[PDB]
Curated annotation (Swiss-Prot):
Phosphorylated by CpxA. It comes from Escherichia coli (strain K12). Response regulator member of the two-component regulatory system CpxA/CpxR which responds to envelope stress response by activating expression of downstream genes including cpxP, degP, dsbA and ppiA. Required for efficient binding of stationary phase cells to hydrophobic surfaces, part of the process of biofilm formation. Induced upon cell surface binding, subsequently induces genes it controls (cpxP, dsbA and spy, degP is only partially induced). Binds and activates transcription from the degP promoter; binding is enhanced by phosphorylation. Disruption phenotype: Loss of the Cpx envelope stress response. A double cpxR-cpxA mutant decreases transcription of degP. Cells are less sensitive to killing by nalidixic acid; double cpxR-srkA disruption mutants are as sensitive to killing as single srkA mutants, suggesting the SrkA protein kinase is partially regulated by CpxR. Hypersensitive to alkaline pH (greater than pH 8.8). Decreased numbers of stationary phase cells bind to hydrophobic surfaces, cellular adhesion has altered dynamic properties; no induction of cpxR when cells bind to hydrophobic surfaces. The chain holds residues 131 to 232 of 232 of the full protein. This is Transcriptional regulatory protein CpxR.
Length: 102
């Protein structure tokens, strides 16, 4: 899979490694998986069901908030974008997107 860039973030799937402005980030494999999947669909909503299966290998239930917890942890770990945008947007029910540059 190809290396993806968003803002100063670089996602290299060949190493399952994320870097920001040239510095490697301390991400779990699960975190990397989630980031890369959202970045492939940059600016478009990815379903909770798809994220649950692809990132966690499990079927979504209405009481499982693990993907949102991953987003919470990612928002703590990721430096602020140079471009000022959020990294993510939550679309209630529909899932999450990684925010496009404008
Ligand atoms: Cl964000």
């Amino acid at each position: 899979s190809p290396t993806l860039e968003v803002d100063a973030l670089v996602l290299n799937p060949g190493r399952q490694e994320a870097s920001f402005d040239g510095q490697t980030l301390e991400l779990t494999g699960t975190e990397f998986t989630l980031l890369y999947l959202l970045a492939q669909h940059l600016g478009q909503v990815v379903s909770r069901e798809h994220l649950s299966q692809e990132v966690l290998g499990k079927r979504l239930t209405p009481f499982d908030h693990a993907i949102d917890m991953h987003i919470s942890n990612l928002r703590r770990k990721l430096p602020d974008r140079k471009d000022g945008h959020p990294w993510f947007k939550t679309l209630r029910g529909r899932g999450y997107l990684m925010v496009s540059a404008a």
